[PDB]
């Protein structure tokens, strides 16, 4: 086409979606990870994760307001990944890299799994 | 912080949100523009438009599944702007620039209003 493009549009959209999350505006699901609860937007979860994409395209699960993750999933690892979904920023540290990689493999977040594998290989 | 960043994350998120829109997945509102109907995600509309942000943060309007725009709003201008919201791409042409600018001013999409003003000034 003959379209023009606004370079910062996608980043600005994501920034506003994170502002809505921080204010709990139009969140439509709670993700339960052991004792911890995380509120989010189903559409953002699907856009970032192969696991959530599969869950919320399911004709029955699409209507659930609560999703319980596998008890092996670490709440901190999930928190770091949820923050990444809404910001593009990953808080990857020596002390959390194993929990982050395991959570990203479960959530099917291929690019995060790739950077965790590379950072582990370097050490 | 000591975060790393995935450059393409915001663009990839927006691409997936547009895929959900094209398949009518988790759309939660219909925007009525004269005789025309447009399905969308309230969160994406809010993230892109000052008008939708104000509408869906309203304690009563946040629950509406149908929003009717002012009858002066042109359906094609709205369609071009809705496409821009989900893609960062604006189909700005000589034949639509006046309707696009008027719709962007009504929707409170400041960056689109700015490029329309600049393109009109050049001609």
């Amino acid at each position: 086409d003959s379209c023009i493009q606004f370079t910062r549009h996608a980043s600005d959209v994501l920034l506003n979606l994170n502002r809505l999350r921080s204010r709990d505006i139009l969140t439509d699901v709670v993700i339960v990870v052991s004792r911890e609860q995380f509120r989010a937007h189903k559409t953002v979860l699907m856009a970032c994760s192969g696991l959530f994409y599969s869950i919320f395209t399911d004709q029955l699960k699409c209507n659930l307001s609560v999703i319980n993750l596998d008890p092996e999933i670490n709440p901190e690892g999930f928190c770091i990944l949820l923050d990444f979904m809404y910001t593009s920023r990953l808080n990857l540290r020596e002390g959390n890299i194993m929990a982050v990689m395991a959570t990203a493999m479960y959530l099917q977040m291929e690019h995060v799994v790739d950077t965790c594998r590379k950072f582990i290989k370097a050490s | 912080d000591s975060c790393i960043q995935f450059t393409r994350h915001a663009s990839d998120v927006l691409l997936n949100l547009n895929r959900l829109r094209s398949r009518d997945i988790l759309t939660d509102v219909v925007i009525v523009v004269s005789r025309e109907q447009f399905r969308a995600h309230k969160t994406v509309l809010m993230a892109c438009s000052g008008l939708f942000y104000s509408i869906f943060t309203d304690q009563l309007k946040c629950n509406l599944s149908v929003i009717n725009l002012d009858p002066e709003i042109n359906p094609e201008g709205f369609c071009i702007l809705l496409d821009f919201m989900y893609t960062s791409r604006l189909n700005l042409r000589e034949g639509n620039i006046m309707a696009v600018m008027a719709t962007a001013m009504y929707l409170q999409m400041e960056h689109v209003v700015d490029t329309c003003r600049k393109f009109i000034k050049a001609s």
Binding site: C3, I4, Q5, F6, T7 | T115
Partner: peptide, 4 residues
Amino acid sequence: WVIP
């Protein structure tokens, strides 16, 4: 704004 750019030409994509």
